[PDB]
Short mmCIF file of C-alpha atoms and ligand atoms in Angstrom, two decimals:
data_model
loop_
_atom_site.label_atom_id
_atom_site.label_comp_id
_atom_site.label_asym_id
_atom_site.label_seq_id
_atom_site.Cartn_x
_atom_site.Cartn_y
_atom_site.Cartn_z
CA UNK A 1 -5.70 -4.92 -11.99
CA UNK A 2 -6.97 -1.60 -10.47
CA UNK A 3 -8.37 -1.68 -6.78
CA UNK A 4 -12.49 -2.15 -7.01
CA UNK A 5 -14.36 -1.45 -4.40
CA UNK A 6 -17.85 -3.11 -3.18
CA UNK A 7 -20.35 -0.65 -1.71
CA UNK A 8 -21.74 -2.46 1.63
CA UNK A 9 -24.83 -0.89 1.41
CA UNK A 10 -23.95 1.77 4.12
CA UNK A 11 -22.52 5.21 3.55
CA UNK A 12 -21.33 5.59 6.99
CA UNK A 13 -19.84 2.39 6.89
CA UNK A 14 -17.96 2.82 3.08
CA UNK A 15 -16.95 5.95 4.47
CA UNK A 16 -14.79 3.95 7.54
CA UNK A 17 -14.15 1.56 4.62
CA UNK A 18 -12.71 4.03 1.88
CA UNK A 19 -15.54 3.59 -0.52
CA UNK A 20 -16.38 -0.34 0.50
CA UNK A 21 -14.35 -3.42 0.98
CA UNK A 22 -11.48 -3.86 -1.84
CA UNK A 23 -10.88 -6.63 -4.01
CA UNK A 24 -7.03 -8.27 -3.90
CA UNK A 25 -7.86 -8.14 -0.25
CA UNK A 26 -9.19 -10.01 2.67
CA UNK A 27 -11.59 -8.24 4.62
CA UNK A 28 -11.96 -10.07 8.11
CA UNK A 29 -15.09 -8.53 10.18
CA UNK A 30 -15.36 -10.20 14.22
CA UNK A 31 -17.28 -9.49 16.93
CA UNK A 32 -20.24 -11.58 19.41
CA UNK A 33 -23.18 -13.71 17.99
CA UNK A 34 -25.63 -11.91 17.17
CA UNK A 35 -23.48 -8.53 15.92
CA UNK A 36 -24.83 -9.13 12.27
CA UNK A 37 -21.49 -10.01 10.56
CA UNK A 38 -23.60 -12.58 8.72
CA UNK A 39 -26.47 -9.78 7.58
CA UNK A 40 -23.50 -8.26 6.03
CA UNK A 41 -22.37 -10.95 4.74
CA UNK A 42 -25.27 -11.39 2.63
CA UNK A 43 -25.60 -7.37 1.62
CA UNK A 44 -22.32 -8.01 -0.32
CA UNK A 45 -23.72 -11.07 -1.78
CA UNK A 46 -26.11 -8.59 -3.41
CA UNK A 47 -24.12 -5.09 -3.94
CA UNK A 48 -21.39 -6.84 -5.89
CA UNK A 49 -24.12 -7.63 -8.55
CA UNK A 50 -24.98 -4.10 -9.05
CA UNK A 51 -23.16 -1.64 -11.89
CA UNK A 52 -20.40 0.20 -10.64
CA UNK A 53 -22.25 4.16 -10.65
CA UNK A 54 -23.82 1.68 -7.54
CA UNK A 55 -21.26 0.59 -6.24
CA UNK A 56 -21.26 -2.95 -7.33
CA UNK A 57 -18.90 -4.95 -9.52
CA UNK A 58 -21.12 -6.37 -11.94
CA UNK A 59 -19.53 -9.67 -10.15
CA UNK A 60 -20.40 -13.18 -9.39
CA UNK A 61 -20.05 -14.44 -6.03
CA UNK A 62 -18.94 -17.77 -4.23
CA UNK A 63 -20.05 -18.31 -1.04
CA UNK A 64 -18.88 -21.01 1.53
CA UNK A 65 -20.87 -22.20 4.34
CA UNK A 66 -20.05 -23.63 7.65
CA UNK A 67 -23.27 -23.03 9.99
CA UNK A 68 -25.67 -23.37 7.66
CA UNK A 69 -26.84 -19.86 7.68
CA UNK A 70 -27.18 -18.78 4.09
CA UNK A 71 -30.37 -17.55 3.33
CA UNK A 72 -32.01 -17.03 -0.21
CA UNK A 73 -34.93 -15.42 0.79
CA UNK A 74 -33.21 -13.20 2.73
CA UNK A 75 -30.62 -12.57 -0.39
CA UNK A 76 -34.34 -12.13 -2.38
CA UNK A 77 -35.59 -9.64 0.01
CA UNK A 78 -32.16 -7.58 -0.28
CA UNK A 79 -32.27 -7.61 -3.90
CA UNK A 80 -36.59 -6.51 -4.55
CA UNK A 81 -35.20 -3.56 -2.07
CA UNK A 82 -32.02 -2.67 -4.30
CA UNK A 83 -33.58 -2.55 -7.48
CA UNK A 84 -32.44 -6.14 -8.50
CA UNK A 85 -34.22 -9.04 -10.00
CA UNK A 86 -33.72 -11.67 -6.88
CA UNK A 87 -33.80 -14.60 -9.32
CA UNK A 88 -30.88 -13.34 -11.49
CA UNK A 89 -28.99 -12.17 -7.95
CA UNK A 90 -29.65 -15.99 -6.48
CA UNK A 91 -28.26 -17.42 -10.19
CA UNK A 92 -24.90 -15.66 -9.57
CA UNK A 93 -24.70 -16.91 -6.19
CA UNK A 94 -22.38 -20.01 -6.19
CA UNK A 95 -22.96 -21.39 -2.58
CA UNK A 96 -21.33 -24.60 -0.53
CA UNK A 97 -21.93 -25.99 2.50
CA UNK A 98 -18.52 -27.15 4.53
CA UNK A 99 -18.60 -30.22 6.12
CA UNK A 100 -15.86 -29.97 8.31
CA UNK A 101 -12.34 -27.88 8.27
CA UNK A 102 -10.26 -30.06 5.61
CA UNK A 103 -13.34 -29.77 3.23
CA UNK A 104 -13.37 -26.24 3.93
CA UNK A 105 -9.88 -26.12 2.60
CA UNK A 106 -10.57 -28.27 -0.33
CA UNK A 107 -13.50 -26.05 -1.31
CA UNK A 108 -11.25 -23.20 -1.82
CA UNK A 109 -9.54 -25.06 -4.52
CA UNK A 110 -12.24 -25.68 -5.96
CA UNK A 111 -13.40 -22.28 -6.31
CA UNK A 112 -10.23 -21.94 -8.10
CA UNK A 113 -12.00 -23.19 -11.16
CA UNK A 114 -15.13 -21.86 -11.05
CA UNK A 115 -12.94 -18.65 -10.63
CA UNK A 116 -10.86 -19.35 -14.19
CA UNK A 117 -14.16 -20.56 -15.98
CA UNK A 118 -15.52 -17.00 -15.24
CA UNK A 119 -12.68 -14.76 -15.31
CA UNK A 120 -13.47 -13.46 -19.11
CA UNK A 121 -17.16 -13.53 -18.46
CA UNK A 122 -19.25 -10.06 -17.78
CA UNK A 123 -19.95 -11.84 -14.80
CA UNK A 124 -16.49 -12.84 -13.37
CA UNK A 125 -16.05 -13.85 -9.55
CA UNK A 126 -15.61 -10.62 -7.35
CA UNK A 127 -16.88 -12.07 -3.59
CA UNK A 128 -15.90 -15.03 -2.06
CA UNK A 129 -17.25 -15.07 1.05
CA UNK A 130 -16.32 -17.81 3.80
CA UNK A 131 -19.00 -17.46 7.01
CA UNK A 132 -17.99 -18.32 9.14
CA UNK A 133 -14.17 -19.00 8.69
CA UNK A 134 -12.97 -20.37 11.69
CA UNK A 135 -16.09 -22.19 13.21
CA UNK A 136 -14.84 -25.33 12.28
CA UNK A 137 -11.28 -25.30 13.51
CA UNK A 138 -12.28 -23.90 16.72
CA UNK A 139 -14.34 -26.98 17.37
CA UNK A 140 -11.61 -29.30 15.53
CA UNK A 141 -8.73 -28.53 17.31
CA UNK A 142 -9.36 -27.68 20.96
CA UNK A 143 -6.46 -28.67 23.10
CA UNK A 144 -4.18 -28.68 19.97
CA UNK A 145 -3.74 -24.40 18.97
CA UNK A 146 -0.56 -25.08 17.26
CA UNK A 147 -1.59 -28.08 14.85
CA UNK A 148 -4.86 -25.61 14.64
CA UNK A 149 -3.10 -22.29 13.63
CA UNK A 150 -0.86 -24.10 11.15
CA UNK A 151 -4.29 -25.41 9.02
CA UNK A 152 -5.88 -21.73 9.73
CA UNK A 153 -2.50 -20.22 8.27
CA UNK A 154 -2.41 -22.79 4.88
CA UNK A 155 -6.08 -21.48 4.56
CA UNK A 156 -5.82 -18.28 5.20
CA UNK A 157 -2.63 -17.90 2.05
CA UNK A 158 -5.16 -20.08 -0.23
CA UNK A 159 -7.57 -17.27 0.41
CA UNK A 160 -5.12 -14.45 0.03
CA UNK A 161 -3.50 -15.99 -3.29
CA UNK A 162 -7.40 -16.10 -5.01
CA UNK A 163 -7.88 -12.29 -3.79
CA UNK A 164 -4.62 -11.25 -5.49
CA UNK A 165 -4.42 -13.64 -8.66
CA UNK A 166 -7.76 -13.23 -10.08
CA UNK A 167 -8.98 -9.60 -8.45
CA UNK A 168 -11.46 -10.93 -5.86
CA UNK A 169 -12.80 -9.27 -2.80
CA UNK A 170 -12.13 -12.07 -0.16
CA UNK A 171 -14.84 -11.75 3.20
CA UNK A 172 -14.64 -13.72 6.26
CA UNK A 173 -16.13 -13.74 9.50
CA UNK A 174 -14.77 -14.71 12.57
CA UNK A 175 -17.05 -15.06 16.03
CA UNK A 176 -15.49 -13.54 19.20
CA UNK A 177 -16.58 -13.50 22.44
CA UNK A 178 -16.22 -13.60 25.73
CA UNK A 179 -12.52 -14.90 26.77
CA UNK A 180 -12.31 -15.56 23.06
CA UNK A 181 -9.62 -14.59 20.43
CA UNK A 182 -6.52 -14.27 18.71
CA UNK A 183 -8.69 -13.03 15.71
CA UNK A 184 -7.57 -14.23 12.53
CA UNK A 185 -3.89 -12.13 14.41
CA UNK A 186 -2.58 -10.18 11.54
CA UNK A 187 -3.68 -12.29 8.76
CA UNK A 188 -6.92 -10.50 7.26
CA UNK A 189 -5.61 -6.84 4.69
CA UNK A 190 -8.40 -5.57 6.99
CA UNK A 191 -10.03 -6.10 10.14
CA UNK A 192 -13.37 -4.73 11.11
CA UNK A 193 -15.07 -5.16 14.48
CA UNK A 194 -18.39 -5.15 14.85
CA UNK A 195 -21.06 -5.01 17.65
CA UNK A 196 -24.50 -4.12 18.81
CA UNK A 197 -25.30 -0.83 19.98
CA UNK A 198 -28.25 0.68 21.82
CA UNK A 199 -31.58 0.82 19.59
CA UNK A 200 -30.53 -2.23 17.68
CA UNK A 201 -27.74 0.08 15.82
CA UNK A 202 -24.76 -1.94 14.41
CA UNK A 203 -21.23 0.12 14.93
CA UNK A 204 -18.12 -0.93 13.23
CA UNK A 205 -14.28 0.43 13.94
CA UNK A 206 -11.30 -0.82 12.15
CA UNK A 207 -8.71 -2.60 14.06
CA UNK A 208 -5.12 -1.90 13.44
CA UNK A 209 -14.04 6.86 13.82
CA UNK A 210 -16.71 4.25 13.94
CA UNK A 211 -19.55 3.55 11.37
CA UNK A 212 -23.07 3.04 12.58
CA UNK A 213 -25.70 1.32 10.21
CA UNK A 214 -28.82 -0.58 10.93
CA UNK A 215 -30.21 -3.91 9.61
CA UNK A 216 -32.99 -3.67 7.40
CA UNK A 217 -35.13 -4.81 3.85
CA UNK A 218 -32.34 -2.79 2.14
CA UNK A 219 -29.68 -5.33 4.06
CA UNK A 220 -28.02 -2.72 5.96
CA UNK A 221 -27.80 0.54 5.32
CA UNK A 222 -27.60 4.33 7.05
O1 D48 B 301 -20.63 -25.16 -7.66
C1 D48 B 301 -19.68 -24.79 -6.77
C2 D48 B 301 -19.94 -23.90 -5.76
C3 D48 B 301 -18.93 -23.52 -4.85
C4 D48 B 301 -19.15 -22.57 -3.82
C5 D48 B 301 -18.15 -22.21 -2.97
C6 D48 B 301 -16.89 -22.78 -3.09
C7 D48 B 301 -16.63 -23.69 -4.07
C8 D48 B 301 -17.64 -24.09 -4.98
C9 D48 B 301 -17.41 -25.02 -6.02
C10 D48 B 301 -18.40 -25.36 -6.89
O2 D48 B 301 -18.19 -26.22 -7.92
#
């Protein structure tokens, strides 16, 4: 398959981006609470869904959970202000909450067949999105980083096998702060930091310009 692109809502940031995140990839975006990797998170959840002259996929989305910070009416509130009916965006939504790290892993394989039921659909899967992706083995595995980077490293090649096999744009985000980090290393295609700025501005810079966007009804955007 051809590269696709998903629009993020943001010119500046599809600029930084090449024309929005890519599907056979894994896009990895980090940075402090707060920096609004989840906001675009859920922008995606919602641009995917949209024609291509809009820079959507016509796609489906999968969406795993760890904190419990999915929100649909923020998903509806996205989609009223892109020209989207919210209850068809919500219906292509396919969302799980994780438990713990080993049912994280599990899920993925189970979005395996979700993936193959919709593959020859005018709605197949083009977003998975995994928020956040390493919550749960940060809090598993303190005290043990190499039993913890050998699970991350299993999931992480699940991940990149559904991005490349069935033409999927893989997200994840990954919270960083203070002391924190060894990312996701060299794992993600791309990785995109993100933090606050002054005025409530968001700025993004690819690791390995910058973008500037702001959180609004629209998701993000310019
Ligand atoms: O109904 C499902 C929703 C999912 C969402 C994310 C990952 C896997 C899922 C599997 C399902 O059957």
């Amino acid at each position: 398959a051809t590269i696709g692109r998903i629009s993020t809502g943001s010119k500046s940031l599809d600029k930084l981006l090449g024309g929005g995140i890519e599907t056979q990839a894994i896009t990895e975006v980090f940075g402090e609470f707060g920096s609004g990797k989840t906001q675009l998170a859920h922008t995606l959840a919602v641009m995917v869904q949209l024609p291509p002259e809009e820079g959507g996929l016509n796609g489906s989305v999968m969406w795993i959970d760890t904190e419990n910070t999915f929100r649909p009416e923020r998903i509806r509130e996205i989609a009223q202000n892109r020209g989207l009916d919210p209850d068809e965006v919500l219906k292509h939504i396919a969302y799980a909450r994780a438990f713990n790290s080993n049912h994280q892993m599990l899920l993925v394989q189970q979005a395996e067949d979700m993936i193959k039921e919709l593959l020859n659909t005018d709605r197949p899967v083009k977003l998975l999105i995994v928020d956040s992706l390493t919550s749960h083995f940060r809090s598993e595995y303190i005290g043990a980083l190499a039993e913890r980077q050998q699970k991350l490293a299993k999931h992480l090649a699940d991940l990149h096998r559904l991005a490349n096999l069935y033409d999927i744009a893989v997200f994840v985000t990954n919270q960083v702060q203070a002391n924190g980090g060894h990312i996701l290393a060299h794992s993600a295609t791309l990785r995109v930091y993100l933090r606050k700025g002054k005025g409530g501005k968001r700025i993004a810079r690819l690791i390995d310009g910058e973008a500037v966007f702001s959180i609004t009804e629209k998701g993000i955007e310019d």
